[PDB]
RNA sequence: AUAUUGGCGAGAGACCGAUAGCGAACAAGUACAGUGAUGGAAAGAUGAAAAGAACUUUGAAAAGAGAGUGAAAAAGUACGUGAAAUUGUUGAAAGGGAAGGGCAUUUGAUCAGACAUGGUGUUUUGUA
RNA sequence: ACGGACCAAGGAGUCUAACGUCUAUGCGAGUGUUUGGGUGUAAAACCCAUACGCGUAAUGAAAGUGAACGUAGGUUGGGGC
């Protein structure tokens, strides 16, 4: 009669698959793991925890925190890694040229890199001419900035959003949002 | 096949309106073929079956076996053959009635509205 | 004339019929949970059946093997009899209930022809 | 579908996912927002703090086309003009050629400050403005136009 | 470099005009979008019924 | 009945508008007879448009 | 001309044929390569040997 | 142009299927109960064709044994096949105030597979 | 302690409106064809105009106003390179 100190058969919190359909992803993920067991390179082994991310955990990446990349040290001339597809800033103006090897490109981001003087090459065709991951730059998407994250934690004195269709007043702005309807949260 | 918005494919109205069909119509829903013989003196390949007609069997038990029509039955859709009967055990003998679509013309009845008929379908004649 | 395999144990060679099964006429031999909290044969006691679980698993080498040793397939056609090419000592061969006499047997001698066992060549002979 | 409902792998525990003591009841508290000043304020003065009382007055008969007000920012302003002509526009900033940008046209009203744009003299017929807007406009070398 | 094909004429034969391709026939194949797209299709060439 | 962090509802239902429903099934059956009644207007009422 | 191309636009408005995300049909064509076969250390035996 | 669970005339349904679906697939709002206002059923299927039991004998009749009919009465107006409860009967077995039960084996009855394998020297064999 | 003489047929966490959690999918600062028109192999299918809801900004009771000093700052911890 071994006592378990912990908990039984308890799961690593972690997918060991996709749970997602994608006849091109049950290929895109098994070349990734081909080089997760061949090369020892710690870049194959979060990709690969990538492919096991929900749209919430693949925000779309944005050209424009792209553009940021280029103005620092060492990503001048290094090509950019995103995980998920790619969205065009309308927002931003000036680019230079420079590689990127996304999942994928929507319309609009896949015209102004490639109108700029860049290119946009998929994930497999950069990962043969960057093996280990040699002059790579990946980066991340807005987790924290959804519309659920915001109405997560409330509770009185905190202020996590609540939830209603409707704003304005009339809406949860009486008793209890004023020093005089008794008092204010 | 189904292309026109007056006509139906379903099988009740069709089980209901041959159940429940008058006798007018029902000298329709017996019609018989002729033979290569009547369909040369003629041309025509169907006609609906009468009592002063010479009808032979090549089908089912009876599979050879003519005979002259002594009294079609509408009521169950039959006609009963002179030539053609079943005997019982007790000694009585009647007559059996079967469906004309088994039973090919080999002679036929004209009358007034009998010529007007072959040639209304599309017949010589005689 | 089989493939290698071991000598086919399966531990409980019983029947797992269900309580009761034995005392009324409404309750049949098929093996049905019973949710009573008062159920004195799902607390496992000294007296009862014993309830069949997961721990009477058999062994892939031997598994679904009939009595000589081979996984059963079921056929309806002389086409899916040449399907046993290379599945002769594998598999043995074995007719439906709802085919005609004459049409199995010319299956039958097609399939003693290639090399496969028929676990039912007594059905429908008439002698 | 009926097939993915677990409610079928209830079908033999026999209380089907609703317990054995208090077991499943019709309308068990209440029905809807019954009890809110009552036995469920606990729920009411965390997660919905405000719901009972009074705000601030009322408007008898309101519509919103004295409220129609989309705003723009800084941040676009470019977009309302075909990249054939926008980086046409763009590239050589001269005078005299300043784009003419109607927000009227576009289904707008008020103009906002986001997020900078880049050094080229342009025109705009817009209703209402921002202070920041308006500084970062007269720096740039265009003028805006009055609108009714 | 298009993969061409040959045309054919109604006593069957091969024809010697060789043609280029639309293309879509080397884009994406997802057998699952389909799957899920099926079961929505199909009620829409449906009907009602009550009691 | 108040219970969870969610958006109160507002669905008026209290009623018995088990009677008071409205069934769009001629909806496509409409627009046929729509078309049949314009191409019998420009037909009836002349080669007018 | 009906669905479009690399060249033509496509008749429909707002549509454009999907997007690509592989290169290759055939995945063991891709990952045999030349510089794959190269940065790749030593293999293994396929079914591992019971020590003990 | 908007409506429509009544009437009338048509075409359909990922509807339902004789304790269903309408109360109602039939002499059905009929039988039948109630002072009355009202309430409100059970019941589809023989057989391809009644081709429906002629006829002998025993019997008061009903019928019996047969025969005949019939592709099939293990298809007969109490009729397609005919589930369980209950029952007839032969065969089996147990039983000193319950029956029946778990696990092991005795005995009764009963049943599956396995056997040939594969193949070598070969007096040389019914007709490769 | 309560129902349970027997056997069979039926027999109970549903549909749908409005949302939340998680998930896949397409597009993407836009998005939604089936509200409507065209066409027709016909209640299907396929294509389209114009608006609109939601999002792309909040803040106050309201008039009213409304996000770059700084490579969109610094510090601590930080995957990967």
Known sequence: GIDHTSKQHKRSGHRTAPKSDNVYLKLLVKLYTFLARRTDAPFNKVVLKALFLSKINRPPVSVSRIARALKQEGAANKTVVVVGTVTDDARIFEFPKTTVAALRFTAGARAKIVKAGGECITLDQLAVRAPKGQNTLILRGPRNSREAVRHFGMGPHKGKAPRILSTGRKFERARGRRRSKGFKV | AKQSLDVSSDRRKARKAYFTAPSSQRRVLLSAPLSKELRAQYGIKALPIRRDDEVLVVRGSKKGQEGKISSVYRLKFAVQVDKVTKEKVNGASVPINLHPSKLVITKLHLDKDRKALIQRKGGKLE | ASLPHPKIVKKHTKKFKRHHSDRYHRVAENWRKQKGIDSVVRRRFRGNISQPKIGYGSNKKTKFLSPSGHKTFLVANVKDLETLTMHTKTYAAEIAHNISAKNRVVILARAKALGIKVTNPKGRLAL | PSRFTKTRKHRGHVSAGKGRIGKHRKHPGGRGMAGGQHHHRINMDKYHPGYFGKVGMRYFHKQQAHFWKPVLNLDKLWTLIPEDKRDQYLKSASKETAPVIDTLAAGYGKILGKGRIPNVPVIVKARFVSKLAEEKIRAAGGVVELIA | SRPQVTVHSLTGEATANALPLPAVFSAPIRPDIVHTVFTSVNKNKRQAYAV | ?49 | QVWGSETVASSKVGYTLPSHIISTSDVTRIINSSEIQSAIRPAGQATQKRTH
């Open chain 6, 1 to 49: 009945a108040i219970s969870k962090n969610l958006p109160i509802l507002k669905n008026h239902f209290r009623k018995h508008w088990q009677e008071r429903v409205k069934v769009h099934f001629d909806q496509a059956g409409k627009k046929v007879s729509r078309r049949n009644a314009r191409a019998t207007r420009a037909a009836k009422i002349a080669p007018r448009p």
